[PDB]
């Protein structure tokens with residue numbers, strides 16, 4: 432019945448030297464942590480310690496070349512930090528970046544470890560920098576290493592090779608890194624809900640479209656739910672969970688649920704442009720809690736409204752603590768394009784999941 436929570440203010444050291452007003456702020460995790468305390472949530476949680484991930488552990492998903500390059504930034508002058516950052520898409524690097532990335536990954540490892548050994552049932556991870564944009568061989572979208580993808584591989588390493596892990600990505604952006612890493616894998620099911628706008632939205636690749644269902648023996652284990660036609664919210668995401676996410680999740684029957692929990696699809700986020708409410712995230716969380724005997728780990732990704740992400744992630748923790756879900760309203764009607772999007776995904780994954788038809 433116990434809920435774990437990991438947070439370490441050392442992960443605030445990662446910062447943008449040239450634009451201190453960059454959205455991926457250090458206070459993102461501190462504000463969220465503060466909110467948990469204000470709402471009597473932190474006290475009801477078991478504090479899981481943070482730790483450094485090992486280079487051995489990074490190698491579960493990342494090439495040795497990529498690891499060494501990011502690792503070397505620890506001892507770089509500001510000038511070389513700048514040039515290294517410009518070699519990636521949307522990446523800023525400081526001398527503490529590599530360490531914070533290791534702490535973020537290491538924190539989720541211990542959190543995953545605590546769950547699988549029954550030390551806790553579920554857990555929240557207030558970490559930064561994010562990870563789902565990080566590829567095997569490169570950094571991208573404020574991400575250095577793919578925390579979620581590494582946590583899945585880590586979880587399998589301390590249990591069994593074929594441990595069925597479901598990764599749900601409700602960050603408003605597509606987790607391009609997490610998809611590519613498990614694209615041929617059937618042990619790790621990847622489901623992502625993301626604003627798409629026919630490729631006109633970060634990370635601007637058609638890899639995020641509904642027709643990308645996986646490769647080889649991984650066919651059907653990659654579920655892209657791409658939104659088109661502007662602002663989406665609770666009605667759309669609940670409908671997506673009702674008819675796609677949860678039915679596919681039950682058939683897959685995961686033994687561990689990892690949530691790439693960005694909160695930029697939240698109401699009030701300057702980047703996402705969506706309007707998912709804290710009550711909405713609570714119900715998303717609650718639905719996922721019915722899977723894998725409640726073994727759920729909520730990992731922070733994006734989210735750039737300090738009030739929105741503090742209120743939203745706190746709601747998720749409240750649900751994990753077993754609290755009653757708040758009242759959800761105005762779930763009807765949906766934007767028409769949302770129904771169309773869900774219908775395209777259903778059509779695409781109908782051959783692989785009988786629970787859809």
Ligand SMILES: Cc1[nH]c2ccccc2c1CCNCc1ccc(/C=C/C(=O)NO)cc1
Nearest residue numbers: 450453454521572573602604633693732733
């Ligand atoms: C959004 C933003 N504000 C800035 C301020 C200074 C420097 C770069 C920036 C950027 C990045 C612009 N590149 C495009 C881009 C890249 C990444 C993202 C967010 C992705 C994300 O965090 N997903 O979880 C959004 C837009």
Ligand SMILES: [K+]
Nearest residue numbers: 600602604624
């Ligand atoms: K996503």
Ligand SMILES: [K+]
Nearest residue numbers: 613616619652
């Ligand atoms: K997969």
Ligand SMILES: [Zn+2]
Nearest residue numbers: 602604693733
């Ligand atoms: Zn995002």
